[PDB]
Structure formats: structure tokens, C-alpha cells
Design a protein around this nucleic acid. Structure first.
Ligand code: SF4
Ligand SMILES: [Ca+2]
Length: 596
DNA sequence: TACG
């Protein structure tokens, strides 16, 4: 109700006079409706389309549900859009590649469609008149499936989801797409073109925008792994392993690359990840092979031209024209030409060994979004100054504070909590749990600590473990909402029903190379390394978790933070109490709330 | 100064 009116007003007027707007508003405030109504209002006046970017299928389904409602209220021409990597049914049938890209799939699809047009309808049996049928268009526009549901619909009806989405798109006013789809600039431009629209002509809603920095860093980062090298090696043998020069064959070049990477990892990586200089890869190359830099560069160029050859050979024989040689050479070459200030060259022994261009500053990647009107929504994004510096977005901001009765939520920190430190941490967690007897999830900073703590004990509990799983995460959540007690999980993972959360320590980031790189970056740039690389991400983590506790005026919930250093976060959690025995303090809180 |  009332919080929504003033937020919509603020969002609407802000768009007239700025390139975007940022709204913080708590969980349960209806961010997606506030954004939709503001954007639709604004866009109807000026004849613009609306693009809603989401990071996960869960954010996707939330938005698509809201949009389905409005559909009765008003006429809503919305579809999901995703690229061929997720929506092409055919290629995972005819091939099992371990890496893929959009361009290889365009070439592959276009060839399949030509074969179908030439009268070989079985070449791709998904490419048929149904792509443009009233049945298909009605299901998209009237049912408004998620991309997952539409893929499932497409399999069942023998019709291609990708092409169907693309055919409906000129007639969509609203598109729900992954950040990863739209922020791929190559893909983006084809996509705007099939939409029939310029960047000037859209309002983009950035769902859960507090992730925007990491979404930028992630799409801006790339790596070269040993395993990628190995797949290139195989590809080289299959395609003739030609001389690139001198008496250096493709496989020799690959061996040079791999052995350099392996030597770097063996000599440089101690405790874990380490930051190196970009030219160091080249140095190893030069010294191990007694070659100049210009000679190694020429060989890398020859390796890319070889990959071009492989893509061409694959294409003409009907395969997906993806080349690991091409993919590897372009990453090695880009790795060596990277902005030494905005990026960190990172060496890791993880996953068999890799080298990475870690994008430290996402403002560059995120900048194309300024060509559109943007709406940045999150529960978890003040101090805006921090967001602005980091994203490069200088736009009006409004915080909707608390909308729900403050007495229905108890947040506290306890300062009592090494091998003795664990035993205390466990004893403290135990009293709270056994004594309070309510549906709880305990968040740990690390899996190690989770395990270390998961004895002493015990009480029944479940664990968002190791490499869950996607499927298993659902069975787990569903268990927790019925035969329901205590869940353990880590702050990195994908996490009435939820009544308590216990933070077994503050989820500070690991002091690894990337994080130290980010610290150094923001320290050199703003003298705020600690604030931007440690404090702000941790506050965000904490609030996202707390935020799930109350999603209604009548919802009840407690959170306790088992950490001395928690008072430091009051400036992001201003209502937080200190406690000296949280067991009883919390216990008494739930009694009070039971009174009505 | 202060991150697992
Ligand atoms: S029509 Fe669809 S399924 Fe067939 S190749 Fe193209 S994208 Fe893949
Ligand atoms: Ca190519």
C-alpha cells in the first residue's frame, strides 16, 4: 500500500530527469510491481519497451508470476527470452561439447534451417511452422511461461523454443531475460534488432541489483584452464595437427601453453590463489621455449587461424562449429592485452590449474546500460554512494525503510564468540536451538566451519552441502517446509516456515587473491578498500539472509549474529540489539509475539 | 587497523 505510491512516484519522476533510478525496499514490499508499474507508466507515455533482467530462474519465476496477475488487470504482451545455449534443443542431441558460445550455435542453427528449407525436414525437426502458429503465440502471450517451462513445452510439441521466442518478440512489449543474455553485447545487438528497437527505446529493470557489481565482474572475467588446453589438444589431433611454423605443430604449441601454465602454478601458488602480472605468462613462454614475445604472439595468431579452420570443417559436415583451439587462442591473446588496473591476473591451482583475468571494476561492462533507462531494485543496496562508485551509476536514490511492525522482528548480536572458539560457538548454537525450538537456518562463513561446528552437537539437521545439486536443493527446501527444524548452509549458497536465523560468525569474504585485488583497487582509487571490498559485500550478504525472515505484516522472526565484530554493521542494520545470553532473549521474544 |  502507501510505501508503494511514493516509491512509484519517485521512480516515475526520476526517469524523466535521469538515465536511471535506484530503489531500496525491503523483502515483501513488491519491488517487481513497483518497478513494473513505474516502467509501464513511464514507457506507455513515451512509446518504449520494457526489459526485465534476472539472474536466476527463481527471480525469473517471481517476476513472471507478478506479470501474470497484471494480465487480468491490463493487457500484457510479455515473453521470456533466452539464447540458443539454453533454448536450442537440437545441439545437445547431436553433440556433447564442454564449452559453447552463441556464434557457433548461430552458424549451426542457420545451417540446419537451410537444410530444412531445402526439403530435409528431419535435419532439425523442431524447425517447422509451429514456430509461428497461433497455438505457439497464444501459449507464450496468454500463459507467459518461464523460459524453462517454454523449453519443456517446445520439447513436448516438437517446436523450437528459441526460434518461437524470436518470432514472438517483435510483438512483445515486455521481455524477461537473463543478465548473461543481454550483457553479451554481440547477442544483445541481434536481440535488439529482432526486437525492432534501439537501446534508447527501452526501460531496463535490474532485478536484485545488489548483484550488479558481481554480474559485471563475472561476465568480464575469463580464464584459461589446463582442461581447456587438453580439449584443444584432442581437437588438434582430430583436425590434422598441422605445422603452424618452424617445426612447431598445433599440439606442440598447446604443450608449450600447458607446460607454462603448469610451471607457473607449481612455482607461484602456495597457500591458494595468487596474483601475478599479466606478462608473466609470456615470460614463461619466452624463457621455456627460447623464443621472443613476437614469435610466441605469431604462433598464438596461427593457433587462432587454425581454430577458424576447425570451425569451418565442423560447419560443413553439419556439426556445431565450436573450436577449442579458437577459444583458447582468443583467451590467451586477450589475457595478455588486458587493462592492468581494472583487471587482476590470477593464478590458481584449483580445478587442475588455471590463469584468470579477474575483472575488478565492473563499471566498464555495466556502462552500455546507461544507453537505456534503468531501474535498480534491491532490498539491500544502501549506502548508495558505494553502489554508485562501484557500478559507475550516478542516479537518484530512495530508501524505503521498514514497512512492517518493528516489534515482530528481533535482530541481535552476541559477543561471546581456535579450537576453544569452536567449542564455545557450538555450545552457544546448541542452547539457542534446543531452547528456542523453532524453524531455523544457521548460516556459516565456510563449509569447514559448518563441519567443524556440526560437532559438537547434536540435533537433527540438514546441510546445503558441497556441490548441491539444483535438484537436491529443492527436495531439501521442501523437507524443511514440512518435517521442519534446523538447516545448515554457507553464505555463498543459493539460500511460519522460517522463524530464526543464526549467523555462526560474520560472513566476511575469504582473504584470497581476488579479494585482496579488490581491496587494493578500491584503496588506490578511493581510500576505501576496507569499506568497498569487505564491509559492503558482507552487509549485503547479512541483510539478504535477514531479509528472508519477514515477508508480511503478520510474519514473525528472530536473527542472532554470533560475532564480536557485529556492532560495526549497525550502520547497515540500525535496529540491531546486543545480547549477552541470546538463548533466553530470543526465547522470550517469541513468547511476546504469540500474544496476538 | 579490520577478511575464511
Ligand atoms: S531451430 Fe532451434 S532447435 Fe533447431 S537448430 Fe535452431 S535453435 Fe536449435
Ligand atoms: Ca571464427
Amino acid at each position: 500500500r502507501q510505501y508503494q505510491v511514493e516509491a512509484i512516484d519517485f521512480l516515475r519522476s526520476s526517469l524523466q530527469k535521469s538515465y536511471g533510478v535506484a530503489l531500496e525496499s525491503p523483502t515483501g514490499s513488491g519491488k517487481t510491481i513497483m518497478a513494473l508499474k513505474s516502467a509501464l507508466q513511464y514507457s506507455s507515455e513515451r512509446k518504449l519497451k520494457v526489459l526485465y533482467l534476472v539472474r536466476t530462474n527463481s527471480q525469473e519465476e517471481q517476476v513472471i508470476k507478478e506479470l501474470r496477475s497484471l494480465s487480468s488487470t491490463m493487457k500484457i504482451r510479455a515473453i521470456p527470452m533466452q539464447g540458443r545455449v539454453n533454448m536450442c534443443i537440437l545441439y545437445r542431441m547431436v553433440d556433447d561439447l564442454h564449452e559453447i558460445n552463441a556464434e557457433s550455435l548461430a552458424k549451426f542453427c542457420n545451417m540446419k534451417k537451410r537444410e530444412v528449407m531445402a526439403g530435409n525436414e528431419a535435419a532439425c525437426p523442431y524447425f517447422n511452422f509451429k514456430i509461428r502458429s497461433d497455438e505457439t503465440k497464444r501459449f507464450l502471450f496468454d500463459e507467459l511461461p518461464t523460459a524453462e517451462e517454454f523449453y519443456d513445452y517446445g520439447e513436448r510439441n516438437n517446436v523450437c523454443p528459441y526460434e518461437s521466442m524470436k518470432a514472438a518478440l517483435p510483438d512483445a512489449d515486455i521481455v524477461i531475460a537473463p543478465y548473461a543474455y543481454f550483457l553479451n553485447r554481440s547477442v544483445a545487438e541481434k536481440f535488439l534488432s529482432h526486437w525492432g528497437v534501439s537501446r534508447n527505446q527501452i526501460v531496463i529493470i535490474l532485478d536484485e541489483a545488489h548483484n550488479l557489481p558481481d554480474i559485471g565482474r563475472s561476465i568480464g572475467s575469463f580464464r584459461i584452464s589446463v582442461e581447456s588446453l587438453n580439449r584443444a589438444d584432442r581437437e588438434a589431433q582430430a583436425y590434422g595437427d598441422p605445422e603452424l611454423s618452424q617445426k612447431i605443430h598445433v599440439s606442440d604449441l598447446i604443450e608449450m601453453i600447458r607446460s607454462a601454465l603448469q610451471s607457473m602454478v607449481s612455482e607461484r601458488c602456495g597457500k591458494g590463489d595468487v596474483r601475478i602480472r599479466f606478462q608473466e605468462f609470456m615470460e614463461y613462454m619466452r624463457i621455456m621455449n627460447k623464443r621472443s614475445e613476437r614469435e610466441i604472439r605469431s604462433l598464438l595468431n596461427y593457433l587462432y587461424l587454425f581454430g577458424e579452420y576447425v570451425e569451418n570443417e565442423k560447419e560443413k559436415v553439419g556439426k556445431v562449429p565450436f573450436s577449442y583451439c579458437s577459444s583458447v587462442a582468443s583467451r590467451i591473446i586477450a589475457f595478455s592485452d588486458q587493462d592492468e588496473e581494472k583487471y587482476a591476473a590470477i593464478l590458481s591451482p584449483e580445478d587442475g590449474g588455471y590463469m584468470q583475468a579477474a575483472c575488478l571494476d565492473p563499471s566498464g561492462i555495466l556502462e552500455v546500460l546507461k544507453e537505456s533507462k534503468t531501474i535498480h531494485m534491491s532490498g539491500t543496496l544502501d549506502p548508495f554512494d558505494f553502489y554508485s562508485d562501484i557500478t559507475g551509476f550516478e542516479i537518484p536514490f530512495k530508501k524505503i525503510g521498514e514497512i512492517f511492525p518493528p516489534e515482530n522482528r528481533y535482530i541481535a548480536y552476541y559477543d561471546g564468540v581456535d579450537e576453544k572458539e569452536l567449542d564455545r560457538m557450538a555450545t552457544v548454537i546448541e542452547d539457542i536451538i534446543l531452547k528456542v525450538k523453532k524453524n531455523t537456518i544457521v548460516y556459516f562463513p565456510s563449509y569447514s566451519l559448518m563441519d567443524r561446528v556440526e560437532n559438537r552437537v547434536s540435533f537433527e539437521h540438514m546441510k546445503e552441502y558441497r556441490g548441491i545439486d539444483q535438484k537436491e536443493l529443492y527436495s531439501m527446501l521442501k523437507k524443511f517446509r514440512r518435517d521442519h527444524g534446523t538447516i545448515f548452509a554457507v553464505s555463498g549458497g543459493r539460500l511460519n516456515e522460517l522463524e530464526m536465523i543464526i549467523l555462526a560468525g560474520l560472513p566476511f569474504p575469504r582473504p584470497d587473491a581476488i579479494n585482496r585485488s579488490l581491496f587494493d583497487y578500491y584503496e588506490r582509487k578511493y581510500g576505501k578498500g576496507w569499506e568497498y571490498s569487505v564491509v559492503y559485500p558482507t552487509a549485503i550478504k547479512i541483510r539478504q539472509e535477514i531479509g528472508r525472515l519477514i515477508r508480511s505484516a503478520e510474519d514473525t522472526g528472530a536473527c542472532v549474529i554470533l560475532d564480536k565484530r557485529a556492532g560495526q554493521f549497525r550502520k547497515f542494520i540500525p535496529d540491531m540489539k546486543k545480547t549477552s545470553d541470546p538463548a533466553s532473549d530470543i526465547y522470550n521474544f517469541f513468547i511476546s509475539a504469540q500474544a496476538r
